[PDB]
């Protein structure tokens, strides 16, 4: 056995740096405590443990985060809740992990919100524009909401009709243009953009088992944009756009099917062009990710350290 | 969400009373405490919450309970390990929650070990007959141990040959007379036997999936044997004695398919002529029950409450 939650949320980022690509992920401990566990290029997961705690949250709290790069070094953004479903922040500035002032503000989410995170523009000569969405009662037909920071927290828009506590995928394809990914009343997943003035439904479409969990990432001159989606003990659905949509597809091993137990979530990163992980929550209870290479394709990699409990 | 620990095991028991069938069923909860959930007759469930502990125990810790009625009122006796593997003991002594005697022997067990308890001969006028089971390594081909209170904790035998970690399931047909089931080597369900003498393996042998939970219950003059087994997410299975051995069978709703998680376990208890109680863990996380109504048959029955987590 481990130490990771079962039905943990998971939220994960990555960079690329001089010497291999960069990672992080983020999942909750059997004591309701974020971890963080590490990877450099190629070389084993690191961390995991009970030495890797930046944090504390509800339990079965919602996940997400963001990073770039700034002068005084790499910058990381973690959103969870509170046990009063107040939205909270932990901040690594460059050398140290503390709290952020996003809790202070007290925004409530309806307690099973999930929460996505997208930021554009942070660099070491530039403030960073960080969005975050979530949703504020569990309903069906519920909005998403947003927050913004520019400089300062304040309320952005809200969109949308879903299905109960829905799986947001968000991304910034491009300063200023996002695309945000859920899954509607009719269980459809649908797609929300800005482009520059407001926000309106865009183009993509598919079917999906209600209640899957949805993640998305982006790159690009295109730009590319990969939709993530799974139901636990399902395989793994892609969407992917290169300029246009193809056909969404399941990403599998014939000797290893439906990997992921049931009621799990997945969380997915991207860096370089194109270095893509898509995790999720197996048997053990453990943590792993699908990797993907160009050209050769997608296989599942190395497992992610989440703890032995004592007496193991 | 609850406060029921995935993987976690189930111990249950039951007694006749007037007014109504007594059960109760142990089970941990995220914080490695042992919980308490009880049932009157078919009024609905109570306890299982954080003020329903009786103690604590190594996270993912095996469990065994048994009980019989003495002149101090209820006995009930409750078997788990320490974070040093160190098979200890809760005693609820017709009035209330101890700890046992048993730990101070110092017995340690294999870290994957399972537990099965039986009694027999307890009363208001004689003493309990209590052996409990377990292993003292995890390879594949260990045997199976046992500890003996009459009067004071010793040794007892060892036997078998089994699959790492095997399910046990214990049973007392009748004074003196034992029957012990695990899962062999060859991934065959076997019986164990002990009649006055010495202890001989059983006639009864089914197959099984690899590393399925077991439990075993009788009642009765001729007597009558029930031996349960399951995988988890698969259905569950039950070898029924009413003299000699009928053909293993699944139990099953066609409405609700292999209800179970994978890698969960089971418990059963037994009273009366006779009611029986098959529990599981389910999507939810749930603690779940099959009850059995003698000429009607089996049905998925009331939900056990195992607690809310703040914030939801
Ligand atoms: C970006 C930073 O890298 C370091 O190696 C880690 O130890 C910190 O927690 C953080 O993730
Ligand atoms: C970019 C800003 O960095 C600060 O340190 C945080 O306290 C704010 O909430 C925001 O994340
Ligand atoms: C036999 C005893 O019954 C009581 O109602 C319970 O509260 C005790 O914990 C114990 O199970
Ligand atoms: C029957 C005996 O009751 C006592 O209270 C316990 O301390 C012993 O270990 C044993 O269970
Ligand atoms: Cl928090
Ligand atoms: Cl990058
Ligand atoms: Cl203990
Ligand atoms: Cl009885
Ligand atoms: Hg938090
Ligand atoms: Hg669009
Ligand atoms: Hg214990
Ligand atoms: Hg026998």
Redesign the interface.
Known sequence: ?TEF???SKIAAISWAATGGRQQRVYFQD??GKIREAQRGGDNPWTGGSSQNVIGEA????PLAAVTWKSAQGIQIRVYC?????ILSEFVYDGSKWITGQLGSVGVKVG?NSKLAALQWGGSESAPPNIRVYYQKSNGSGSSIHEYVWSGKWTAGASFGSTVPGTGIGATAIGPGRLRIYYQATDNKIREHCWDSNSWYVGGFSASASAGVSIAAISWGSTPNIRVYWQKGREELYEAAYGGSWNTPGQIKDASRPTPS???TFIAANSSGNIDISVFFQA?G?SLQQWQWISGKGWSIGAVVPTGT????
């Open positions: 056995p939650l079962y039905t059997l004591n509800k339990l079965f709290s809740v509170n046990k009063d479903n307690s137990l049931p009621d048997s209870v409990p004592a007496g193991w």
